[PDB]
Paper text:
The stator unit consists of two types of membrane proteins (the A- and B-subunits) called MotA and MotB for the H+-driven stator, PomA and PomB for the Na+-driven stator from Vibrio species, and MotP and MotS for the Na+-driven stator from some Bacillus species. The B-subunit consists of an N-terminal transmembrane helix that contains an aspartate residue critical for specific ion flux through the stator and a C-terminal periplasmic region containing an OmpA-like domain that binds to the peptidoglycan (PG) layer through the peptidoglycan binding (PGB) motif and/or the T-ring to anchor the stator unit around the rotor. Bs-MotPS assembles around the rotor depending on the external Na+ concentration. The crystal structures and SEC analyses of MotS68–242 at high and low Na+ concentrations revealed that the periplasmic region of Bs-MotS is in a folded state and forms a homodimer regardless of the external Na+ concentration.
The crystals suitable for X-ray analysis were grown from a solution containing 92 mM NaCl. The crystal structure of Bs-MotS68–242 was determined at 1.89 Å resolution. The asymmetric unit of the crystal contains a Bs-MotS68–242 dimer (Sub-A and Sub-B) related by a pseudo-two-fold symmetry. The N-terminal 15 residues of Sub-A, 12 residues of Sub-B, and C-terminal 6 residues of both subunits were not modeled because of poor electron density. The overall structure of Bs-MotS68–242 resembles those of St-MotBc and Va-PomBc. Bs-MotS68–242 consists of an N-terminal α-helix (α1) and a single core domain composed of three α-helices (α2, α3, and α4) and five β-strands (β1, β2, β3, β4, and β5), which includes an OmpA-like domain. α1 of Bs-MotS68–242 projected from the core domain as in St-MotBc. A short helix following α1 of St-MotBc and Va-PomBc does not exist in Bs-MotS68–242, and α1 of Bs-MotS68–242 is connected to β1 by a loop composed of five residues. The subunit interface of Bs-MotSc is formed by α3 and β4. β4 forms an inter-subunit hydrogen bond with β4 of the other subunit, forming a ten-stranded inter-subunit β-sheet, and the side chains of α3 interact with those of α3 in the other subunit. However, the helix–helix interaction of Bs-MotS68–242 is hydrophobic, whereas those of St-MotBc and Va-MotBc are hydrophilic. The crystal structures of BsMotS68–242 at 40 mM NaCl/300 mM KCl, 92 mM NaCl, and 300 mM NaCl showed almost an identical dimer structure, indicating that no unfolding occurs at less than 100 mM NaCl.
Numbering used by the authors:
A (entry chain A): 84 to 236
B (entry chain B): 81 to 236
The structure:
């Protein structure tokens, strides 16, 4: 356990150096928690509101993330999170479906376009069950709309 | 030493209760149960829940899902619903890939549980595995059929 704090710090340092070197600080942030090292991407850099298709302009960002993931062996868990708003549609009848569609759409890009191996990935949808703070203000809901790319321990 | 055995014995009792529930309610043709390192797992082949390539829960399945919700109501565990496909690459306009179909199927089950059966949202996690976790492999049509499934994981 004492040596796995060192390797988690090494990885977080490597990810933060990659973000610096590639000038990605406005598009993503990285952190460390019990899951491992986590890249957080706000909804606006990947999708339109209430949609789960990866925007053409997000492809460069996901490519740069793929380049990083290609150099490490860890399994990758992509989590989708929504705010608590009801923006239901025919394609996404609830936040469960929307959050799971966003996670799986990111993974579809990583595996089908960037050719990272499917076996490294798990798609996870949390709907609105894991807010950053809450959904009591517009700013709090906006930060709840995110994808988290978890570089698993 | 007795702690490993204690936890494993408790998991044995949980699986026994689930199997007895399946038996007593005459559900053997629709679902099976097993356990592994994740916990105790209910397995539902896709045809008891969905039509082919779709993630809309069938009206037929509402009775089965209600009986499962009654079971889930009696235990406190977190519930992880996993969607699985076989390895055959099919797309569609709404589900461009097995990743999206598998996650939409897990999501659709949870949405039924939380909207229609009123189980609390915070108990659930939706998981999509595409074809990465076969029951055994994809070497035969019958193995591919059993791979198209939803697993409801009663987490440890």
């Amino acid at each position: 356990t004492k040596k796995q704090e060192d390797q988690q710090d090494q990885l977080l340092k490597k990810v933060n150096t990659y973000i610096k070197d590639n000038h990605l600080k406005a598009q993503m942030t990285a952190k460390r928690d019990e899951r491992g090292v986590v890249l957080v991407l706000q909804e606006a850099v990947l999708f339109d509101t209430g949609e789960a298709k990866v925007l053409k302009n997000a492809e460069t960002l996901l490519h740069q993330i793929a380049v990083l993931l290609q150099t490490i062996p860890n399994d990758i868990q992509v989590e989708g999170h929504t705010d608590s708003r009801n923006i239901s549609t025919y394609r996404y009848p609830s936040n469960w479906e929307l959050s799971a569609a966003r996670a799986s759409g990111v993974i579809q890009y990583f595996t089908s376009k960037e050719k990272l191996p499917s076996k490294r990935f798990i798609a996870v949808g949390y709907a609105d069950t894991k807010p950053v703070k809450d959904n009591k203000t517009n700013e709090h809901m906006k930060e709840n709309r995110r994808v988290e790319i978890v570089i698993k321990k």
